[PDB]
Write a protein that binds this ligand. Structure first.
Ligand SMILES: Nc1nc2c(c(=O)[nH]1)N[C@H]1C(S)=C(S)[C@@H](COP(=O)(O)OP(=O)(O)OC[C@H]3O[C@@H](n4cnc5c(=O)[nH]c(N)nc54)[C@H](O)[C@@H]3O)O[C@H]1N2
Ligand SMILES: Nc1nc2c(c(=O)[nH]1)N[C@H]1C(S)=C(S)[C@@H](COP(=O)(O)OP(=O)(O)OC[C@H]3O[C@@H](n4cnc5c(=O)[nH]c(N)nc54)[C@H](O)[C@@H]3O)O[C@H]1N2
Ligand code: SF4
Ligand code: SF4
Ligand code: SF4
Ligand code: SF4
Ligand code: F3S
Ligand SMILES: [Mo]
Lengths: 1218, 465
């Protein structure tokens, strides 16, 4: 009847607009945004993606429950509508302004007054926000920036924003402003611990993985520490559907996770011990498919694509030998006929016993052309050769080599197997007379590997296995004791996996994630899985390989976006910084370090050469140009040029001289001296101070200068030993940040602790672009409605700040000269820095040579009053120098000519005649036109540049797509697939899906490693001395965070120490959506923690009881979720719950309960600090220390008093435990 | 004899990942209103569990569905006509708010307006959407048991664990969990229609969609008790009841329901089914509970039979609807391959939203075992999910139809692996389950590739008439 028209009317709408989500999920899903009466009402997925091959499932509809709830945010009660400022700060700002008409002077009068400063800094996170205006906040922000740059330096200003792929222009907005003024741009991939150091170590690549549709081409898949249905939702169907094609799937998780539901088998190893299982599996694979019944496919594969045939020099020790660095052409007489970089070319024996320097080692990459390829050819004669794998059978003798074993150094919480700290093995060796006349013994990476796995080969090695049941280093029986997983399961799966790979030539795949990558020894977890895939020739074959998925790390049109984001079109270089080191330093988490480098060393290392605090290793790496610094120098870099002049020297020589004598020092040596810490911080597209940042309480104490919940004592208080490179103070400097500016659309935890909050446009109110690792489409974010209330897009917000800055700086900053340090970069000729060992110029072991034994020292001219005009225009450097990345470069004049027609040009001023960058769409068109993956004309030029290096034609990969040009307005009509480009190793082809390593294997392009092949052996001095030259099991570390505080503040209830894991949640993407009512209603209405039934019973905890979790780092409050699916001994607080909703007071700190990162703290690893060594050289987000976190242990107990600390008389009391 | 058409729906639970996207999109479009904020027309429950409202499958408790009188005739379990009208005044079985959950919100504004000099960090506390008062603690939600959240012995009170020796499943190594997304079944013998004396509830003749006339509803609520799936919710603000409307505004235009098109897992299929409306009473009245499944299959007509077509046209079914029925993916799954099964057929409503049971990891053992009938792939007997459990859920306790569905999907996998990995034709598994290569290939086409045009085959309703 007529009443039916009611529901019909509800569905009717005014229009649908296409947009996506700028959140770090990797989803990259296109949606239909419905508008009714000028308001967004709901969204449903777009289904018009270009379809995949008929034999593969299509992508539609993608989507997930979080994204489906985004519309809730637009007019919600938590929406940020106007610029906000802390009341106390606004009061002082206005009083000061009445005294000083110049805002810079105004700011000065405030921040130079200890009492005034302390006044608003202590108000952080304590209410009092007041509505301001754009004009007011823009002037204050600009004045602060000018004051900081002028009195301390450009690099005392910084910005944090991650994952540019989820919203490219939005990321670029702030990064471009900062890069122009010289501020610091902080990294995120390493900081978040999504970067797997094992990737750069093995392939010389940040991360390149198969697309999800490629899982469908696989016939055997293991989901290892990856909760696919929950953390890869829009792609999960490829996994569920491929099972119908006959593909067997295996889930490896300690708990019964959602992924288990989808597999044919569930294996539950003890969390953190996965490397042990991987080792035993590789052991079985080597025994049966390489040794006992040699696989034709596997053998040929490892011979041509790995460093297994490469020779390693043995170091003579007391009674035995230690594996040293890899033999180089320069070690032999006449350097094997290599005049160019002979010290960077590895060596192997051909199948005729002759030595040869094979094509492809990193030495052939620079200084010459045409031999940097994986053709099996003699690098001297050019003739084809066949490399020899094993020396067994042609050895001159047998040596006993020592291998480090840590499988017995576990903590009391994990099972261990005692053997010997050093295991001696029988190795076939050859005697060589080096160029200096001396003799050396060598062996291949191949037998060192077989030895390390404990495989008996006909010698009488007592440390090798006589059976899989023999408890020896890395046998199933050994792994069974360490992991708890049945030895027969380990054996059966290793066989099926390898057998499947042999029958299909590599179509076996391992999907892995943060479950394994967030452990301190993520390096070993990954190298374990990687070795299995390599032994089976899976890497580089469609349907096979290393499928690492974490955040939305892959911004496909990389070289088009880089120049925009870091203003490389106007000035080079910018100031990049690796965040883990940055925060370990400035939030002073190093002052509480409990882990020593000494306990990480290989038993065969010279302890005396590795003394000092972990932070000393970082400072040393920085001075050697291995890692970046921020702030860089202990003096304002804008004042160095004027002194070099007074001293009749050029800026660079003056700086090098000063560093040598000590008149100028690296700021990292004296971090608390009052001039070497960041003072201004911009935060956007991030909830750092409230969820991302590990060591939450330390950040509150040292960065913000506010109340905190740290429970333990620092270094001085425990009589511990201090740093040898950094000064020490019993009372660390607190409240370092003078101003914290956060841009968001919802009032997050970070916002709650900022000084100024800027309202930004939601994803449905602005234009931008988005790409992902999961699929090959680039699509847009669009404005279905104009920004609500007083919100503005990130691009417009930073543009306005830039415009105001250009005005406020006049008279304070003009055309300045800046001295910028730049670490030795991977993918640059300088990557061939220190070939044979490590020398520290500061220790007088070599001279300070910029770009080789020290960072590069660069001169950058900055026209401060022209900041806005440069921001809003594409610079002349693209036409003068060119564009490029990943080691190649090309001319891009044709793209600039086109951009002048699409964006129009400046009619006057400093950038007269340059293409304009007024709108977000102008910036998007710049990215699309410049990138090889979106402009076929550039793709061909890029492939041609690479062809010069390899000597092989690669242009055929993009020639058939030359002429294709992706335009912003076209992707609004339909998402488009990108173009095959040299920036990536997978292909965009009609017949084969995108599979990483495909071009290396099929086009014979070398991996960017020392040997040019997949690097199984790491020969850098530090890798060797820290025991990681080869894969070895390393148990979870002891953070020593419980012992000192357990039982110290009893509340009467039973306490217990448990392993604190933080896998990503089902009701949000990180903290985004965490405050969204739809997600809160489908979850449990706020912060909760999962506990096994056993542990819960022991603690007298019932489902949903209020509990407290803490350790020396801090404390958090939450409700419990008691479940059978959680194994005893571990607790899970799904990552992303924040500090703004449903949290009562803490009984441990008497403050608002903390977050999951209140109980964690940064602890770096020296091997992640290595630089100046081919594949181990710096790159923004490419290498650097990571924010590992799964090793953490905490104290858990039922809460007693539930106080909300809010003033109402609504507090509760939970009945005792008894 | 009266031929009717209805768009049936099949959810492949083997592919469900329990994401709840389906629940969010339905909520956004149809129930984001005061009065039904607590109602989820489409909701997903993790099993083992008691669900939403709590223990809804317990008819002895809620009195839903039909019962068969000793005289062979059907009567609502909640009473005859007389008793029903009496329950307009007193109905002691209605689901209480605690059986669902007290809907809540949070004081987000406190984060914005917290005054200067606050003694602690401002926080957003919960507040009831019903009373508007502060809530000291959230104790319930519509999805509280998600992913086995709660002590097992409490979750195990699941009605489907009836007649099953539970003990062993209360052990870590034997853990199992599945997801049950569900909406209104738009039944052929709706108990809701029979429990509302005024006739405010009706099943549309053109498409079988069951709706509650908002003008006619008086809030008597016997229908809430009557529906054994508890899919009718009281709108406390309007004083009327509401339920899933099968997105008729979209179905009438030849589009999928919102929850089907937005299903991230691509597990939902929509297709036309023709049936003899005059054969429903007899089928729902069959004596043995375990015959209800087959009796319902018997009312579905063959859209390709010339007489059926002829009769359909005479009864007013547009030719385009009949042609859609001939391409129905739902017919193939329910009638031909026998993969889809009804949800609780014993309630006697002849539900129209069917389910394909899920496969699961093999049972835990430690003894890695050896190859089986299906090689490295599982054999139906080794699946960790107790088949009796799936039987109580989908076939009134009869494991035979469930084992057949599961066994047929496994056979497809075995056949396809031989083809794609060994490059050979092996039909042993197919022969063992009564399927031909042609069938296995079409199953693969619809279940694995699942192109959009194959998942939804919905004809428009010819509104010009
Ligand atoms: N819904 C949703 N999806 C997300 C995100 C989100 O916040 N929400 N985050 C995205 C981002 S940025 C990232 S980096 C990824 C991370 O997501 P994943 O790569 O899935 O990482 P984890 O969540 O740690 O997943 C590890 C899984 O393995 C198990 N596990 C835990 N510890 C171990 C261990 O030591 N060994 C083994 N074998 N298993 C273990 C757990 O059951 C857990 O579910 O998620 C992405 N997807
Ligand atoms: N203990 C522990 N810590 C972890 C992890 C873990 O597993 N364990 N996971 C780590 C990992 S892998 C990651 S990826 C990080 C993620 O950490 P974050 O990057 O902090 O993640 P979100 O919480 O999503 O923060 C994004 C913020 O951006 C805002 N936002 C969204 N879009 C826009 C936009 O267009 N403009 C602006 N101006 N703001 C916007 C949102 O409202 C939100 O508050 O957390 C890391 N920290
Ligand atoms: S949040 Fe990410 S995964 Fe979810 S719908 Fe949005 S883009 Fe897709
Ligand atoms: S959207 Fe689809 S896969 Fe996700 S829970 Fe609902 S029915 Fe299952
Ligand atoms: S499931 Fe729907 S049609 Fe069937 S009885 Fe319940 S409300 Fe009525
Ligand atoms: S068919 Fe429509 S009304 Fe019914 S549950 Fe699905 S989306 Fe909601
Ligand atoms: S019994 Fe009838 S009166 Fe309304 S509440 Fe149910 S449709
Ligand atoms: Mo991440």
């Amino acid at each position: 009847r007529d009443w039916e028209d009611g529901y019909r009317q509800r569905w009717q709408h005014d229009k649908i607009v296409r947009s996506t989500h700028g959140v770090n999920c990797t989803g990259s899903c296109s949606w239909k945004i419905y508008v009714k009466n000028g308001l967004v009402t709901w969204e449903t997925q777009q289904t018009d993606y270009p379809r995949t091959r008929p034999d593969l499932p299509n992508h539609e509809p993608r989507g997930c429950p979080r994204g489906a709830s985004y519309s809730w945010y637009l007019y919600s009660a938590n929406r940020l509508k106007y610029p906000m400022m802390r009341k106390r700060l606004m009061k002082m700002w206005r009083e000061a302004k009445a005294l000083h008409s110049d805002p810079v002077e105004a700011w000065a009068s405030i921040i130079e007054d200890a009492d005034k400063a302390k006044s608003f800094k202590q108000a952080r996170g304590r209410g009092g926000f007041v509505r301001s205006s754009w004009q007011e906040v823009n002037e204050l922000i600009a004045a602060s920036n000018v004051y900081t740059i002028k009195n301390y330096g450009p690099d005392r200003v910084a910005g944090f924003s991650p994952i540019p792929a989820m919203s490219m222009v939005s990321y670029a907005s702030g990064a471009r402003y900062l890069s122009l003024i010289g501020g610091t741009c902080l990294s995120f991939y390493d900081w978040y611990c999504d970067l797997p150091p094992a990737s750069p170590q093995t392939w010389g690549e940040q991360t390149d993985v198969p697309e999800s549709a490629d899982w469908y081409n696989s016939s055997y898949i293991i989901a290892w520490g990856s909760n696919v249905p929950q953390t890869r939702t829009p792609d999960a169907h490829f996994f569920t559907e491929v099972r119908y094609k006959g593909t067997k799937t295996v889930a490896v998780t300690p708990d019964y996770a959602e992924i288990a539901k989808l597999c044919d088998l569930w294996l539950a190893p003890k969390q953190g011990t996965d490397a042990a299982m991987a080792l035993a599996m590789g052991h079985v694979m080597l025994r049966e498919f390489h040794l006992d019944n040699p696989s034709q496919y596997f053998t040929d594969y490892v011979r041509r694509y790995t460093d297994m045939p490469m020779l390693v020099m043995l170091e003579e020790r007391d009674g035995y030998y230690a594996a040293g660095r890899m033999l180089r052409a320069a070690d032999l007489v006449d350097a094997l006929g290599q005049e160019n970089n002979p010290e960077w070319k590895t060596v192997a024996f051909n199948t005729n016993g002759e030595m040869v320097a094979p094509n492809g080692s990193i030495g052939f990459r620079w200084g010459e052309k045409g031999k940097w390829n994986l053709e099996q050819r003699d690098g001297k004669t050019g003739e084809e050769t066949e490399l020899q794998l094993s020396l067994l059978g042609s050895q001159d003798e047998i040596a006993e080599v020592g291998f480090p074993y840590f499988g017995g150094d576990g903590t009391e919480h994990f099972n261990k197997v005692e053997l010997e700290n050093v295991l001696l093995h029988k190795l076939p060796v050859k005697r060589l007379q080096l160029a200096d006349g001396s003799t050396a013994l060598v062996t291949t990476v191949y037998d060192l590997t077989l030895a390390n796995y404990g495989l008996e080969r006909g010698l009488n090695d007592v440390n090798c296995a006589t059976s899989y049941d023999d408890v020896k280093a890395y046998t199933p029986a050994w792994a069974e004791q360490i992991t708890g997983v049945s030895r027969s399961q380990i054996i059966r799966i290793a066989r099926e996996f390898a057998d499947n790979a042999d029958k299909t030539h590599g179509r076996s795949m391992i999907i892995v994630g943060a479950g394994l990558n967030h452990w301190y020894h993520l390096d070993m977890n990954y190298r374990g899985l990687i070795n299995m895939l390599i032994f089976c020739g899976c890497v580089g074959q469609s349907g096979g390989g290393w499928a690492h998925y974490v955040g939305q790390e892959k911004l496909r049109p990389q070289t088009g976006w880089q120049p925009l984001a870091f203003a490389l079109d106007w000035q080079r270089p910018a100031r990049h910084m690796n965040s883990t080191s940055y925060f370990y330093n400035h939030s002073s988490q190093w002052r509480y370090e409990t882990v020593t480098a000494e306990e990480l060393l290989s038993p065969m290392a010279d302890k005396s050469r590795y003394t000092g605090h972990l932070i000393d290793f970082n400072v040393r790496a920085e001075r050697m140009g291995w890692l970046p610094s921020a702030p860089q120098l202990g003096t304002n870099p804008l004042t160095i040029a004027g002194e070099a002049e007074k001293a009749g020297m050029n800026p660079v020589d003056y700086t090098v001289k000063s560093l040598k004598e000590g008149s100028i020092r690296f700021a990292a040596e004296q971090p608390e001296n009052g001039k070497n810490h960041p003072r201004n911080l911009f935060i956007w597209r991030s909830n750092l101070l409230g969820s991302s940042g590990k060591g939450h309480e330390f950040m509150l104490k040292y960065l913000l200068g506010t109340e905190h919940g740290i429970q333990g004592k620092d270094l001085g208080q425990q009589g511990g030993v201090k740093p040898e490179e950094v000064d020490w103070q019993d009372n660390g400097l607190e409240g370092k940040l003078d101003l914290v500016v956060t841009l968001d659309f919802r009032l997050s935890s970070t916002c709650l602790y900022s000084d100024i909050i800027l309202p930004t446009a939601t994803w449905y109110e602005k234009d931008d672009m988005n790409t992902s690792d999961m699929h090959p489409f680039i699509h847009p974010l669009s404005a279905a409605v104009d920004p609500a209330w007083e919100a503005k897009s990130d691009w417009e917000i930073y543009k306005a700040i830039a415009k105001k800055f250009s005005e406020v700086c006049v008279g304070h900053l003009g055309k300045e000269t800046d001295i910028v340090t730049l670490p030795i970069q991977h993918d640059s000729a300088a990557e061939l820095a220190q070939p044979l060992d490590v020398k520290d110029w500061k220790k007088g072991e070599c001279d300070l040579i910029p770009g080789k034994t020290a960072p590069h020292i660069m001169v950058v001219e900055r026209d401060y009053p022209a900041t806005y005009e440069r921001f809003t225009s594409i610079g002349p450097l693209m036409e003068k120098i060119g564009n490029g990345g990943k080691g190649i470069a090309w001319n891009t004049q044709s793209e600039m000519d086109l951009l002048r027609k699409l964006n129009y040009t400046k009619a006057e001023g400093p950038a007269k005649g340059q293409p304009m960058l007024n709108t977000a769409i102008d910036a998007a068109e710049m990215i699309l036109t410049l990138a090889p993956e979106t402009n076929g004309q550039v793709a061909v030029k890029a492939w041609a540049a690479l062809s010069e290096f390899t000597g092989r034609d690669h242009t055929h990969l993009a020639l058939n797509k030359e002429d294709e040009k992706i335009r912003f307005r076209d992707i609004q009509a339909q998402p488009r697939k990108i173009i095959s480009s040299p920036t990536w190793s997978g292909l965009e082809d009609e017949h084969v899906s995108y599979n990483a390593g495909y071009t290396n294997v099929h086009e014979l392009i070398p991996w960017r490693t020392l040997s040019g092949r997949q690097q199984l052996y790491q020969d850098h001095q530090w890798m060797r001395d820290f025991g990681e030259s080869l894969l070895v099991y390393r148990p979870p570390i002891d953070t020593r965070s419980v012992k000192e505080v357990i039982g110290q503040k009893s509340n009467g209830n039973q306490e217990k120490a448990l392993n604190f894991l933080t896998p990503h949640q089902k009701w949000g993407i990180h903290s985004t959506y965490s405050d969204n009512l739809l997600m809160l209603t489908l979850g449990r209405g706020g912060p909760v923690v999962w506990l096994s039934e056993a542990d819960a019973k022991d603690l007298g905890i019932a489902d949903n009881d209020w509990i407290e979790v803490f350790n020396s780092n801090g404390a958090l409050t939450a409700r419990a979720v008691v479940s059978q699916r959680v194994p005893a001994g571990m607790t899970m607080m799904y990552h992303a719950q924040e500090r703004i909703v449903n949290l009562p007071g803490s009984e441990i700190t008497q403050q608002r309960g903390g977050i999951h990162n209140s109980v964690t703290r940064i602890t770096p690893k020296p091997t992640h600090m290595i630089g100046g060594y081919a594949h181990l050289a710096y790159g923004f987000n490419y290498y650097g220390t990571v924010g590992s976190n799964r090793d953490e242990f905490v104290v858990v107990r039922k809460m007693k008093n539930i106080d909300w600390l809010d003033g109402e008389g609504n507090d509760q009391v939970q009945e005792s435990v008894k | 004899m009266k031929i009717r058409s209805q768009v049936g729906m099949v959810l492949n639970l083997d592919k469900c990942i329990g994401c709840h996207t389906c629940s969010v999109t339905c909520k956004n479009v149809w129930t984001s209103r005061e009065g039904v904020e607590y109602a989820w027309f489409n909701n997903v429950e993790t099993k083992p569990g008691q669900g939403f409202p709590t223990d809804w499958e317990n008819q002895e408790k809620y009195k839903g569905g039909w019962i068969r009188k000793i005289n062979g005739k059907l009567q609502p379990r909640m009473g005859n006509r007389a008793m029903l009208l009496g329950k307009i005044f007193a109905n002691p079985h209605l689901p209480g708010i605690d059986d669902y959950y007290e809907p809540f919100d949070f004081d987000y504004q406190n984060l914005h307006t917290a005054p200067e000099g606050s003694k602690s960090q401002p926080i957003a506390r919960p507040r009831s959407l019903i009373t508007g008062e502060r809530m000291a603690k959230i104790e319930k939600g519509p999805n509280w048991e998600d992913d086995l959240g709660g002590e097992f012995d409490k979750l195990a009170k699941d009605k489907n664990f009836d007649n099953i020796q539970k003990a062993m499943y209360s052990q870590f190594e034997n853990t199992f969990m599945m997801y049950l997304p569900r909406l209104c079944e738009h039944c052929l013998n709706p108990a809701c229609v029979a429990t509302c004396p005024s006739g405010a509830i009706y099943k549309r003749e053109e498409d079988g969609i069951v709706l509650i006339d908002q003008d006619k509803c008086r809030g008597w609520r016997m229908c809430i008790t009557g529906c054994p799936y508890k899919k009718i919710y009281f709108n406390w603000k309007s004083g009327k009841s509401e339920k899933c409307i099968f997105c008729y505004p979209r179905i009438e235009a030849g589009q999928p329901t919102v929850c089907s098109e937005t299903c991230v897992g691509r597990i939902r299929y929509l297709g036309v089914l023709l049936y003899d409306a005059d054969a429903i009473e007899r089928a729902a009245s069959t004596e043995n509970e375990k015959d209800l499944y087959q009796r319902q299959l018997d009312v579905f007509l063959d859209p390709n039979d010339p007489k059926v077509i002829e009769q359909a046209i005479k009864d007013g079914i547009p030719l385009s609807v009949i042609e859609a029925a001939q391409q129905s993916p739902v017919y193939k799954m329910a009638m031909e391959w026998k993969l889809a099964l009804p949800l609780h057929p014993e309630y006697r409503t002849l539900p129209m939203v069917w389910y394909v049971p899920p496969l699961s990891p093999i049972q835990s053992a430690a003894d890695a075992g050896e190859l089986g009938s299906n090689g490295i792939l599982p054999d139906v007997e080794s699946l960790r999910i107790p088949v009796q459990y799936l039987a109580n859920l989908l076939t009134a306790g009869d494991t035979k139809p469930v084992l057949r569905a599961l066994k047929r999907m496994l056979a497809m996998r075995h056949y396809k692996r031989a083809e794609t990995v060994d490059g050979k034709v092996d039909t042993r598994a197919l022969e063992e389950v009564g399927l031909t290569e042609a069938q296995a290939q079409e199953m693969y086409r619809y279940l694995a590739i699942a192109n959009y045009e194959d998942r939804f085959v919905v004809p428009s309703s010819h509104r010009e008439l």
